[PDB]
Amino acid sequence: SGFRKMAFPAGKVEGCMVQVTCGTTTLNGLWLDDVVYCPRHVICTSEDMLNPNYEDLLIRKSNHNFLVQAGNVQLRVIGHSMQNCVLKLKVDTANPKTPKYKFVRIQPGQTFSVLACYNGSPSGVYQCAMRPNFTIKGSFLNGSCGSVGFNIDYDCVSFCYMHHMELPTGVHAGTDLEGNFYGPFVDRQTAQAAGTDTTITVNVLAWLYAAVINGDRWFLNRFTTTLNDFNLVAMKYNYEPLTQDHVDILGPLSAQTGIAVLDMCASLKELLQNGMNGRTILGSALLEDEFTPFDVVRQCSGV
Amino acid sequence: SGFRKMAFPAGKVEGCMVQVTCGTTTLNGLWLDDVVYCPRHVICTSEDMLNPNYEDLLIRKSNHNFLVQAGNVQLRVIGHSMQNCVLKLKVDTANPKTPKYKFVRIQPGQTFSVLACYNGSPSGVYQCAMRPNFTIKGSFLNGSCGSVGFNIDYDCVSFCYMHHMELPTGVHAGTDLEGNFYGPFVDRQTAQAAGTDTTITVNVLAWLYAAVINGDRWFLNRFTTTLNDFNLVAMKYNYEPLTQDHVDILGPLSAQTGIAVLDMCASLKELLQNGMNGRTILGSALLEDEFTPFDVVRQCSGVTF
Numbered sequence: 001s002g003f004r005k006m007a008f009p010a011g012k013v014e015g016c017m018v019q020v021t022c023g024t025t026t027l028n029g030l031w032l033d034d035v036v037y038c039p040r041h042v043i044c045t046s047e048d049m050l051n052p053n054y055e056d057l058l059i060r061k062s063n064h065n066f067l068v069q070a071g072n073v074q075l076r077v078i079g080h081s082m083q084n085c086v087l088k089l090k091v092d093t094a095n096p097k098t099p100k101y102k103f104v105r106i107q108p109g110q111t112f113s114v115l116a117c118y119n120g121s122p123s124g125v126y127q128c129a130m131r132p133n134f135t136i137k138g139s140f141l142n143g144s145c146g147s148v149g150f151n152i153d154y155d156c157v158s159f160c161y162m163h164h165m166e167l168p169t170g171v172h173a174g175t176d177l178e179g180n181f182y183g184p185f186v187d188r189q190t191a192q193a194a195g196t197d198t199t200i201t202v203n204v205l206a207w208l209y210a211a212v213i214n215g216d217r218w219f220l221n222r223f224t225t226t227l228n229d230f231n232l233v234a235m236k237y238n239y240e241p242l243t244q245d246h247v248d249i250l251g252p253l254s255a256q257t258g259i260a261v262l263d264m265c266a267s268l269k270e271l272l273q274n275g276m277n278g279r280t281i282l283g284s285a286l287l288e289d290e291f292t293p294f295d296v297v298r299q300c301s302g303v
Numbered sequence: 304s305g306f307r308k309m310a311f312p313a314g315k316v317e318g319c320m321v322q323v324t325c326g327t328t329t330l331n332g333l334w335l336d337d338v339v340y341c342p343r344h345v346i347c348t349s350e351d352m353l354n355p356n357y358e359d360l361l362i363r364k365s366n367h368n369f370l371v372q373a374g375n376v377q378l379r380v381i382g383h384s385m386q387n388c389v390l391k392l393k394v395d396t397a398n399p400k401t402p403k404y405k406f407v408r409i410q411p412g413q414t415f416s417v418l419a420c421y422n423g424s425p426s427g428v429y430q431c432a433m434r435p436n437f438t439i440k441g442s443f444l445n446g447s448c449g450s451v452g453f454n455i456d457y458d459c460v461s462f463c464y465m466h467h468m469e470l471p472t473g474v475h476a477g478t479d480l481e482g483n484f485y486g487p488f489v490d491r492q493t494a495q496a497a498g499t500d501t502t503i504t505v506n507v508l509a510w511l512y513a514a515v516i517n518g519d520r521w522f523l524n525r526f527t528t529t530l531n532d533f534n535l536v537a538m539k540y541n542y543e544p545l546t547q548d549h550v551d552i553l554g555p556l557s558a559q560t561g562i563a564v565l566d567m568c569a570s571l572k573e574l575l576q577n578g579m580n581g582r583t584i585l586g587s588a589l590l591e592d593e594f595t596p597f598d599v600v601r602q603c604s605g606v607t608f
């Protein structure tokens with residue numbers, strides 16, 4: 001029993017983190033085979049970062065301009081190219097710790113594990129969710145650029161995130177491993193805002209099922225709602241609409257607890273309209289929305 | 304910026320997790336150098352666990368009764384001994400991935416990363432706080448016994464926890480790496496209840512220092528207090544009393560902010576006696592008590608290992 005924000009074991013990724021320095025700029029890189037991936041703004045100086053013409057800045061660079069260190073050993077750069085906001089630094093040595101990996105673009109509402117690194121050295125691991133406005137609520141300080149987010153399926157690491165920026169509001173933004181930002185963000189040194197931060201409804205419902213599986217039911221009620229009437233109320237509160245696909249994804253949690261999805265929706269509607277008073281759900285005073293249905297199934301199946 | 308429950312990178316521990324099996328009973332063990340550590344109840348059958356005599360049950364076992372596997376590779380057991388509730392098995396191979404490590408016994412309020420493991424395979428990592436009642440609010444399923452909790456310092460992994468038990472309330476109990484349980488629990492198949500829990504005062508204060516570091520300081524008041532007077536008051540609100548070590552580990556955050564420890568105790572005292580008055584701290588109206596001073600420091604300054 002029990003339910004906790006849980007990340008994947010990061011050992012397979014820890015063996016891929018390196019340090020990338022260009023001039024006075026340093027951040028993290030991801031070393032897979034004989035390629036090191038890192039945010040392209042490492043080639044920038046403090047002045048270039050205000051408005052960088054990356055294609056212009058990149059052509060004026062040589063291989064020896066890039067200092068790549070894997071722990072103690074320094075890796076010799078024998079080529080370099082750009083794929084959107086990701087610099088690809090070819091090296092004369094293939095990482096012997098390269099695991100089975102793939103590059104994927106995660107969907108909003110989905111979760112992944114982040115391996116926060118500084119100076120190429122892992123520092124901490126935690127789980128994040130790709131929010132509807134394509135930001136993530138992480139913990140990133142100066143020098144965390146180049147940190148990656150990932151999921152693991154058996155023996156395959158699916159890389160989905162590389163960190164680039166912290167918005168003025170304190171949330172964070174980044175790209176997939178092909179260098180495409182999540183959201184309307186750009187890698188220039190400017191204050192940038194995201195779209196309205198809507199709540200991942202299917203995740204909140206999954207988290208309510210987890211609370212019930214762990215013996216908490218004070219928020220349940222005998223009322224019921226139609227899918228449309230629930231979505232009417234949810235959208236009023238800046239919640240994402242619940243699709244029939246979401247209803248289907250919640251099936252296992254419904255079968256395990258015996259609470260129909262539309263029954264849980266009636267509970268959430270009451271919570272949204274009445275609040276939680278001073279009560280808590282799984283120790284939280286707010287409705288948690290960064291647990292996916294699968295995150296709940298993996299921790300609550302058989303409980 | 305940002306504040307999260309953050310676990311340590313677990314690569315150094317993942318390379319040490321193995322599976323230990325006796326008969327049909329299987330759990331996790333910790334492979335360090337040429338010794339594997341694991342809960343002693345692996346030697347029990349399902350019925351043995353109801354009322355085991357581990358000394359008697361162990362006398363009937365030999366080295367050849369122990370199946371130790373790293374993945375699918377068997378590690379031949381060449382020696383066995385019992386230390387409290389932990390079984391120590393000498394194997395013929397020294398773990399090449401053994402990291403710098405030490406065995407430590409933590410205090411209530413200290414946090415550590417748990418590497419949840421099943422059949423010797425790491426499955427998840429999350430941060431836990433040792434409650435004052437010597438339980439942890441973990442997430443453990445069948446086959447999780449032998450999972451360890453740890454901290455990482457000078458490239459050294461300090462092992463502090465090995466999983467054994469789930470309580471009826473849904474919390475969890477275990478031992479240190481010397482087999483000594485945290486709290487008054489025993490490795491037996493019975494429903495055992497933990498004492499009444501309390502809030503970890505030192506961690507709440509650390510969380511208040513965190514808010515002040517971030518410019519959120521409305522709660523800072525003009526009063527101070529003695530350590531003794533605060534402890535007597537805090538206990539009336541189900542808060543644990545502070546020790547001299549607690550005051551000392553709060554030192555760095557006290558110097559960083561310029562707020563004396565006993566001054567912030569007086570501020571917390573007012574929050575307990577008067578409430579928040581519809582206000583929040585770091586975005587929450589709930590006082591957080593599972594962030595140690597180091598966690599606040601390690602996360603407000605990005606220390607690596």
Ligand SMILES: *[C@@](O)(CO)[C@H](C[C@@H]1CCNC1=O)NC(=O)[C@H](CC(C)C)NC(=O)c1cc2c(OC)cccc2[nH]1
Binds near residue numbers: 027144167168
């Ligand atoms: C990377 O480590 C840079 O190498 C760093 C990310 C963080 C810094 C602190 N916490 C983090 O997560 N990223 C940046 O500094 C980026 C660099 C861009 C992509 C070139 N810049 C920002 O994240 C950024 C800039 C500004 C800004 O300007 C002016 C105004 C307000 C917020 C802001 N964030």
Ligand SMILES: *[C@@](O)(CO)[C@H](C[C@@H]1CCNC1=O)NC(=O)[C@H](CC(C)C)NC(=O)c1cc2c(OC)cccc2[nH]1
Binds near residue numbers: 344
């Ligand atoms: C280990 O994996 C066993 O090897 C397992 C712990 C969990 C199983 C699911 N989630 C967990 O955390 N541990 C046990 O099953 C222990 C075995 C002891 C140490 C011999 N037993 C319990 O945790 C336990 C027993 C009982 C009980 O009796 C019957 C009544 C109520 C609760 C309870 N928990």
